[PDB]
Design a protein around this nucleic acid. Structure first.
Lengths: 292, 49, 49, 93, 118, 147, 40
DNA sequence: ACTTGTCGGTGGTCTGCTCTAACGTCACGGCCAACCGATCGGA
DNA sequence: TCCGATCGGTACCGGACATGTAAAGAGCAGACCACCGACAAGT
């Protein structure tokens, strides 16, 4: 359920003075802070713990560990290289530094809150402290700059990751039962889950289909197909008349003509002739640079 | 052990709740072993001692 | 009133008028009703079968 | 108490999971044989580097090269008649 | 194009049936029948053809005795016998009873008609 | 229970609901609801309307509310949940066999636990599991997560 | 204070999941170190 | 004389029940992500 | 009166199919079967 963001800010180690000196340019933040009805840091952290995990008796360190596990740890939160790059570009943070971390940080959260309040007020610019100025505007989720392409390699990599996670669970289970001084690498590693996951992907996944072999063109088009359906994607029923449209960003990246005319209209398409794929999964197209 | 019928408890509106004048949350607590309910009380004995 | 209809329910005009006629003669005070407009889904789900 | 209790708890859990886990019940004395065959198959797969044939399992399990086929055929689990066939939800097995 | 009549033409008089509800299978690869859906039933009801609809529902899909009796009558040349009770209705009644619902068919007198014919 | 033991009785589970239904008086409740609806007004009147609807529904028919609590679970004939042998030796099931097996397993375990004399925590947990298994059998997904 | 009231409210939560309820019930009671087992 | 039924035994396989003593003590793997209208239980 | 939350619904035909793991091991007993003895009574 909803909770005022001042509670979340105070739980992150901030005080009333910090919030006042940080969000002193706005009015809605001040109104929210005046109506928080919760002073200090421990009280807000306890309220967040009670709301998030009902039925569990709270203690001092449990709430902090829960917050760190949820947002600021690699174990249970992973803003991938694509996500990290997108957040850095959108909020103007860590400009120049290599993409090494892949987790959310308090700087990102406070920048998001500041961006939201300045967007609501009407400002068209924002510079995060220790950051680069970026324009303030809403995002279109159907834009081809916001839609990426998971190729065959990325899907196989995800399946391998699932298999390795299962194997790691089995290894950790076996580590505490066997006797030390006799444990060897080959007596702990059960390779069966990895190959099982790969086989399950290649034989059950919707994105692994039989090749069309009516003619060479059928196979050539089949290999160059972009599908919006599958695990982690849309369904042909829960998709309105918003994603089945020719966005003006498809020029040179997705063909606006070739698509099925049945119930899958707009959810399946083909790559353009000159289109390429970014390392991040975005689709690039070539242009000739002109000057004067 | 007796078991309630799911249709007549987890329905909108609940029919057991209407019949017994009990909130659906109270029924869920009772029939799923989370709270005790007083089936009957000897008021005559209490009013004398 | 003195009819078997539960208050607040929707009843057919023919049955309601027949019951009122049966109650006014050799009986007591009849029931009062007000016409209702119903959607197609509700009217089809309010059938007698 | 944590040693004797551990022994008895593990025994009870293992025996119950041997009994109450298959639609077509298999006796415990054969579930043990199936598990042993699976473990030997995993070890042979690790050692050889390829998938072990029934011949290797016969030698490493001191059983006939025919009982292994029966054991593998007793391990099949029935599929469900209600599983979906097509992409949408209109077809069933 | 790859849409040839040789792969489209299909016809059947009698073939395999299903298990739970004794209805014909579907598909050319299984020698199945053609579905007479709810819209076709509406069309028949609007036409006023009660007997065609009744025979389509009873003696071509579900009436287990009726199917063999109709085939014998056609072969020997007699009249088509009267339809019986579809098996799907009995399956529905059993499925309702398994939900602790007391569904019973009442005759004109007020007694209960047993569905254990045979 | 310790102090004022012989002054009341409290229960827990479907047995409590069964006893409450046994002590329930349909006629008096219906008369009180009618008095409220002909006297009271406001938000009480709507609740009285709905409660009177249900109570008069139970009063008009010759049945009893006791049918809402089960002491026996019917089992469908086998041919409507077939165990067929597909070609190649593979078998098939109807997904009702699994639910019936779960119900039977939990019922037998409850019988054993009651016969042994286990502490009330284990017996209560087993009874809750039996209730959940029956609910999943009748309607899998209405309460909790689907099996 | 506030912590005790939060604990009391947490222990009285519905906790519709059965596993969570059983875990709470088993966590109600304490353990035995070395000698209480022999006495029992 | 041959057969035959009751008695008794050896050896083998499939199936089920019981027991094993350092110490060990409060579950996860994971979305959900449409979108409309109706309605009961809260605030 | 406003308020989130659960629950109901979303055209037709044609066709298309079957899952990926297990910490084991022993000692003791009843049952059914495949091989056999006697043994007097019946053929």
């Amino acid at each position: 359920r909803r909770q005022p963001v001042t509670v979340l800010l105070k739980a992150l180690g901030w005080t009333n003075e910090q919030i006042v000196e940080r969000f002193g340019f706005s009015e809605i933040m001040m109104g929210t802070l005046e109506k928080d009805t919760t002073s200090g840091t421990d009280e807000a952290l306890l309220d967040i713990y009670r709301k998030l995990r009902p039925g569990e008796p709270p203690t001092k360190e449990s709430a902090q560990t829960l917050l760190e596990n949820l947002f600021f740890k690699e174990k249970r939160y992973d803003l991938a290289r694509v996500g990290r790059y997108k957040v850095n570009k959108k909020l103007g943070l860590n400009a120049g530094k290599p993409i090494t971390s892949s987790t959310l940080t308090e700087e990102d959260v406070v920048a998001t809150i500041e961006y939201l309040v300045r967007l609501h007020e009407g400002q068209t610019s924002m510079t995060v402290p220790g950051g680069v100025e970026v324009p303030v505007e809403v995002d279109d989720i159907d834009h081809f700059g916001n839609r990426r392409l998971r190729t065959v390699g990325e899907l196989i990599q995800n399946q391998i990751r699932v298999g390795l996670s299962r194997m790691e669970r089995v290894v950790r289970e076996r580590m505490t039962t066997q006797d030390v001084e006799a444990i060897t690498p080959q007596t702990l590693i059960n390779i069966r889950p990895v190959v099982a996951a790969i086989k399950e992907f290649f034989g059950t996944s919707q994105l692994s289909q039989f090749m069309d072999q009516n003619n060479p063109l059928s196979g050539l088009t089949h290999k160059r197909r972009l599908s919006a359906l599958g695990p982690g994607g849309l369904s042909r029923e829960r998709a309105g008349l918003e994603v089945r449209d020719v966005h003006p960003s498809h020029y040179g990246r997705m063909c606006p003509i070739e698509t099925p005319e049945g119930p899958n209209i707009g959810l399946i398409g083909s790559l353009s002739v000159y289109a390429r794929v970014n390392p991040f999964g975005f689709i690039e197209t070539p242009y000739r640079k002109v000057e004067n | 052990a007796p078991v309630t019928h799911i249709w007549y408890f987890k329905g909108v509106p609940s029919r057991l709740g209407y019949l017994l004048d009990l909130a659906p949350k109270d029924l869920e607590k009772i029939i799923y072993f989370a709270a005790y309910v007083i089936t009957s009380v000897d008021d005559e004995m209490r009013h004398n001692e | 009133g003195s009819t078997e209809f539960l208050p607040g329910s929707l009843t057919e005009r023919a049955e309601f008028e027949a019951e009122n006629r049966r109650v006014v003669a050799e009986g007591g005070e009849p029931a009062a009703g007000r016409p209702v407009l119903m959607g197609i889904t509700k009217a089809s789900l309010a059938t007698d079968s | 108490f944590s040693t004797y209790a551990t022994w008895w708890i593990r025994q009870a859990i293992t025996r119950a999971m041997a009994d109450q886990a298959r639609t077509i019940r298999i006796p415990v004395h054969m579930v043990e044989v199936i598990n042993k065959l699976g473990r030997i198959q995993r070890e042979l797969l690790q050692d050889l580097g390829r998938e072990p044939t029934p011949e290797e399992l016969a030698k490493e399990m001191d059983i006939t090269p025919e009982k292994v086929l029966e054991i593998q055929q007793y391990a099949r689990e029935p599929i469900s008649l209600d599983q979906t066939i097509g992409d949408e939800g209109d077809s069933q097995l | 194009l790859h849409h040839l009549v040789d792969d489209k033409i299909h016809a059947r008089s009698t073939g395999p049936y299903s298990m739970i509800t004794q209805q014909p299978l579907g598909g050319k690869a299984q020698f199945g029948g053609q579905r007479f859906g709810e819209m076709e039933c509406w069309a028949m009801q609007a036409y006023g053809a009660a007997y065609t609809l009744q025979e389509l529902l009873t003696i071509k899909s579900d009436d287990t005795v009726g199917r063999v009796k109709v085939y014998e009558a056609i072969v020997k040349g007699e009249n088509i016998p009267e339809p019986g009770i579809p098996e799907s209705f009995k399956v529905l009644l059993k499925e309702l009873q398994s939900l602790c619902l007391n569904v019973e068919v009442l005759s004109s007198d007020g007694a209960a008609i047993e569905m254990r014919d045979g | 229970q310790d102090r004022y033991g012989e002054y009341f009785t409290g229960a827990m589970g479907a047995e409590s609901i069964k006893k409450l239904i046994e002590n329930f008086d349909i006629d008096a409740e219906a008369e009180s609801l009618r008095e409220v609806i002909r006297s009271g007004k406001g938000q009480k009147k709507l609740r009285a309307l709905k409660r009177l609807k249900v109570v008069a529904a139970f009063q008009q028919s010759g049945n009893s509310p006791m049918g809402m609590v089960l002491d026996a679970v019917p089992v469908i004939p086998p041919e409507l949940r077939p165990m067929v042998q597909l070609d190649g030796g593979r078998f098939a099931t109807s997904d009702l066999n699994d639910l019936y097996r779960r119900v039977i397993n939990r019922n037998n375990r409850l019988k054993r636990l009651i016969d042994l004399g286990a502490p009330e925590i284990i017996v209560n947990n087993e009874k809750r599991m039996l209730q959940e298994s029956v609910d999943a059998l009748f309607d899998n997904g209405r309460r909790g997560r689907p099996v | 204070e506030a912590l005790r009231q939060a604990r009391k409210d947490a222990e009285l939560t519905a906790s519709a999941d059965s596993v969570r309820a059983y875990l709470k019930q088993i966590g109600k009671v304490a353990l035995l170190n070395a000698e209480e087992e022999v006495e029992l």
